[PDB]
């Protein structure tokens, strides 16, 4: 047992992928570990996507991880637009002007390559009510595209949901990828199968509440973020 | 994806029909886009109709758009009276004198033609508690009369309301028309199905609050307007 | 629509029964129209009755309208006494002397006939907590006595009040009579069902505040009146 | 109605018990009528008691009315002392000398009989925080002792006060006695239930302010009185 | 009541301990009665202490009363020094010479015995912010030392002050001792709980103003005193 | 019977192994007696393991008892890690840093020996759906390893469960060991065969509810504990 515990102690990854933008999230969660499913929730339009997109951007650009993004609602172009804008601290969607300027200026092409040049991000859309068709694509993003993190955006709150979540967790646990699923709050396996659940609350000062973190057991409010309506980034707040 | 994003970027209508009279509304909303439902609310007699009528007048006269107005409460004659007065910066209802003068003077006929001469405005009244009868007329105002904007005045705050709002949003999203619905605040799908919600607050200095704007996410108070009791127009305020 | 709007324009009664004694009331309200309920309020002993009685006297004497007065608190004799005194610019209640003089002098009889001779005023008292018994009498004062205006004095600030106000407005709207209700301020449907609300404020210089006027939307203070403790009349003030 | 109004006019008591000492009080109030509650107030030691005692003395001696005095604070002996002194234009309390002289001289006995000989005044003390015990005694002073006026001295500014005032007014209104209550100002039903409120103001020149008079509506300052420190009487002032 | 009033009249102490030095004080106050609290006030160094000390000296020497003096600021020795000097019409504090002469001359001892020999005066110092500790000592000076008058020197202008004054008045009223409290003017219960308030005003010609006297109601200026800088006595002035 | 009852009275173990950390548990249970099965339950991640591990640590270190721990879910290394951290008031799992520091520093080895040096704790993992294979190991931990207490972590809520619980209780009753079984609440013999059932409730303030205690019959809430997220210990709370 002695040598058995030692090797155990010197090989256990307690700290996972670090989150960004919210002083406190890491304190209460220790980051996202591989094999865990991260649930991010809150009311519609409350900021789930942005928050997750922001983490996706950092993990993939700063942490050198390959991120896969599977969109159920919006298209790749839309997601790409958001990612590109985010990376350049600008909101492409909110400005027909900048959008047209970026094409002729040749900045779009430069921006596209600066972000997607390498094989870091993998965006997939076109996701029917079939779990198995979905799981197959997820597993390919892992095995074939070597994604470290896979974000699933998104799902709405049971057989279906239950079986999906059960298949999602199994997939996560067996491959060791980090799965972050965004879900809308307008449930059962949701709370059970998820390892960590993050909820965003508002009323641009967003309160980040840790509804659950298996690994740490530390729940409660992690901190506050402030949305910069100009850059589109969620920033840490001195609240 | 590159060429896929490019065409996406050079074909996305971010800025919709511009609002008028309130320095700030456009800043926080980017105008009214086609396919979206605009909710305008506030207490009774607080100024919803006027505000919407004013936007209707500009969109149809200045923007060259065809506007349809479906009245559930008041009649066409009443609405027309308001539109005509508005256009001529005069309050016909508040003056038996001007009303009688306008007939003999021949100005009424001249004013009527100057406003309704073209096929720009389409007023319909005579709207029973049947949604389907209503939706049918709306769809005709779009397809048959080619309205760019349809204003529904009005509705009072669930099956009925819920199904109506769900049918209204579906209609809006599928045709691409801009639907602005006025509703009284003395709800469920109301907040959910609406893309942008504008609330007017008073105590003639009216505060315009953006309760919700999907497209932009920018909420809060857009600005202040001042009602000119002489012309009947809501004017921008230096508050 | 053209000919439809024309006839509409040349048949709309914008200006109703003109108020008297307060330079400004008419400006902000355009008078009392038939079918509307006028609410007159303020603290006890603040002057509601006098003010309304004064309007009643003018409408019935000068405007040639038949006025019905339904008293819930005071008796017909009391009301009559006030009306008679008002008409003769004298306060009968404040002088046992004049009261006794008026009988022997034969002036009372002359004064009574000069005011009540014709069928202009209809005073009814003896109004139990039954709305339906009340509404029945009101409807008779309209249909049977042909009253143009009916004053209800008075009511104290909900089922009861709510249902009463809802029945009062329905009665007013359906018959087209002008209903002026006096209410004490020491509410719900009160503010909602009332078309115009007039509030009197003091500390004999009375401030007349227009708390609400559907038809015009013009609110605020209409002007100031001065109570003549000698004649009992509320007079216009140069404040 | 004619004969109904006539009898009404020739049977209405507008002028009540006349006040004394203050040229103007009667002008603004028309005296104290039966069934009304008179509130007399002002700061402690400002002169309420004296003023009321003075009215009590006149009503009972000159007007031939039976006056009941219910004291909550001071004793009968004290009150009697004040009444006796007042009647003889002398301040018994301020002079041990006169007090001792009046006994041997036989004047006390003569003075006592000259004031209390008849059954005009009824002094009662010994008034616990029980309203019902109080009301019972009041009703007896009316029915049993036939008092025309009952003075309650005194009360300090709510259930208790509210219920008391409500019971006081009910008692007054139902029996027709004149109730004058003295209250200290260092309120709710006080202002509401009282028919006339008299306030005394100083800095021996006392300003008499009519804070309220239902019957007449005439408020404001009635006049000025001057306290004669030698006789103890409040006299009319030429201010 | 007759015999009840008689005994009342022949047992009422209207005239209390007579004041000295100011022709007029007694006229407006009738002296200090037992059970009353006398407030003596004015600006610092204006002469409160002297004035009160002077009254204390007379009451105790001439009137044969036992006087207790409770000092909050100065010590017993200081107070004694002032009393001794006062009694001998000399200012001990202003003369190191006389002070040294009085010891050897044996006059001090003779003067001490001539003043304090009997058990007439009781000086106590050493009075912490505790009311209850203070009240206990006061009650002992009354009950145990049999003081007729207790002077409290002094207090500075609320819970504390309010509760103290309320406890002081209660103590005074319940025992019947005469309490004279000196207070500094640089309030609430002060004016209320005090029975008589005397204020000294200057610019050695001191104006004595009676700010309040419950018992008599006679306020205003009582008279003028002149300070003899040689004897330390306040003398009556012919102003 | 007399001598029969006496020896019975002087040989009955009413108080068993005392629990720790929760002021009240012992009051309502009198501790854990040999031959009884203790059920500890609550929702997942609610704190069962920690609580039991804490009791295990004390029983084995302070009470000098030999504790056996049979893990069905986690491994020995994991359990050992928790025990070691607990003993040193530190959370090894939550800190890659401390984990690496403890190896080189030589503290791990020192900590391991300080806890496991003696033959006090017996951890066994690797527990298939076979009851009989399980019971065999349990019986060996008792007979062969001489464990006083055996903790079974854990079981999820019937033949299987029923037969297992029936075999567990039989084992406990026949050997006299103290068996504490942890079970998840997301039943039949569970409630029946268990002698004492402890439930933990949260929302780090944990409510300890005694759902059942045969021996005492005292049920209800024993008290509150507070989780120290820094040391990993459940502490008594002053709630
Ligand atoms: N009361 C508590 N407050 C906060 N965190 C706690 C508390 N109790 C335990 N934890 C933390 C420490 C662990 O990392 C995590 C889970 O505790 P644990 O005892 O393993 O729960 P459990 O045994 O009831 O659940 P399960 O076996 O079902 O996963 O949460
Ligand atoms: N905290 C915030 N403050 C202000 N605007 C925000 C905030 N977060 C996001 N937004 C803006 C940017 C977007 O245009 C819009 C919606 O954000 P988004 O992340 O798409 O919400 P969501 O993903 O939670 O909602 P849903 O998927 O349900 O529509 O609002
Ligand atoms: N801001 C304003 N200040 C003053 N008057 C106004 C204002 N807005 C509108 N009005 C006037 C003009 C109209 O005669 C009247 C009512 O306006 P309107 O737009 O019809 O209110 P609304 O549509 O919100 O109420 P509703 O439908 O519930 O009766 O008040
Ligand atoms: N503005 C005024 N100034 C002075 N006296 C007034 C004024 N208005 C009315 N009065 C006088 C005349 C009446 O005798 C008395 C009460 O007037 P009244 O109209 O009966 O008040 P009100 O109807 O508001 O009160 P309520 O019904 O609650 O008793 O006061
Ligand atoms: N009227 C006066 N004219 C001149 N000197 C006076 C007069 N009264 C008192 N003094 C002198 C004697 C003392 O040495 C000094 C202060 O008198 P004192 O009675 O102690 O004042 P005070 O008691 O009002 O003030 P405090 O307690 O606030 O210091 O002034
Ligand atoms: N106007 C006055 N001027 C001077 N002294 C007056 C005046 N009125 C009354 N007094 C005197 C006579 C009394 O001895 C004393 C108090 O009068 P009193 O009527 O008892 O006051 P009050 O009844 O208002 O006060 P309270 O009941 O609160 O003590 O003052």
Curated annotation (Swiss-Prot), chains A, B, C, D, E, F:
Keywords of the record: ATP-binding, DNA replication, DNA-binding, Helicase, Hydrolase, Magnesium, Metal-binding, Multifunctional enzyme, Nucleotide-binding, Nucleotidyltransferase, Primosome, Transferase, Viral DNA replication, Zinc, Zinc-finger
Residue ranges the record marks as coiled coil: none
Highest taxon listed in the record's lineage: Viruses
Protein name: DNA helicase/primase
Assembly description: Homohexamer. Assembles as a hexamer onto linear or circular ssDNA in the presence of ATP or dTTP. Present in a mixture of heptamers and hexamers in the absence of DNA. Interacts (via C-terminus) with the viral DNA polymerase that is bound to DNA; this interaction is essential to initiate leading-strand DNA synthesis. The priming complex consists of 2 DNA polymerases and 1 helicase-primase hexamer that assemble on the DNA template. Interacts with the single-stranded DNA-binding protein.
Protein family according to the UniProt entry: Belongs to the Teseptimavirus DNA helicase/primase family.
Complete-protein stretch covered: 271 to 547 of 566
Organism from which the protein derives: Escherichia phage T7
Keyword Magnesium tagged: yes
An example molecular function term from Gene Ontology annotations: DNA helicase activity
Comment field on protein domains: The N-terminus zinc finger domain is essential for delivering the primed DNA template to the DNA polymerase. The central core domain contains the primase activity. The C-terminus region is responsible for the helicase activity and binds 1 Mg(2+)-dTTP.
Annotated site residue numbers, dTTP/dATP binding: 91, 184, 202, 214, 227
């Amino acid at each position: 047992m002695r040598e058995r515990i030692r090797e155990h102690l010197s090989s256990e990854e307690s700290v996972g992928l670090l989150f960004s933008g919210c002083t406190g999230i890491n304190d209460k969660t220790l980051g996202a570990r591989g094999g865990e499913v991260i649930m991010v929730t809150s009311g519609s339009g409350m900021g789930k996507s942005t928050f997750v997109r922001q983490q996706a951007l950092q993990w993939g650009t700063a942490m050198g991880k390959k991120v896969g993004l599977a969109m159920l609602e919006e298209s790749v172009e839309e997601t790409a637009e958001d990612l590109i804008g985010l990376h350049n601290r600008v909101r492409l969607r909110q400005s027909d002007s900048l959008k047209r300027e970026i094409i002729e200026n040749g900045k779009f092409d430069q921006w596209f390559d600066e972000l997607f040049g390498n094989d870091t991000f993998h965006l997939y859309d076109s996701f029917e009510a079939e779990t198995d068709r979905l799981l197959a694509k997820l597993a390919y993003m892992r095995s074939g595209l070597g994604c470290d993190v896979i974000i699933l955006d998104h799902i709405s709150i049971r057989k279906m949901i239950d079986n999906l979540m059960t298949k999602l967790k199994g997939f996560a646990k067996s491959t060791g990828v980090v799965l972050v699923v965004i879900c809308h709050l307008k449930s059962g396996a949701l709370r059970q199968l998820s390892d960590t659940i993050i909820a965003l609350e508002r009323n641009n000062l967003v309160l980040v509440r840790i509804l659950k973190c298996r690994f740490t057991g530390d729940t409660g409010i992690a901190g506050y973020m402030e949305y910069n309506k100009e850059t589109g980034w969620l920033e840490p707040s001195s609240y």
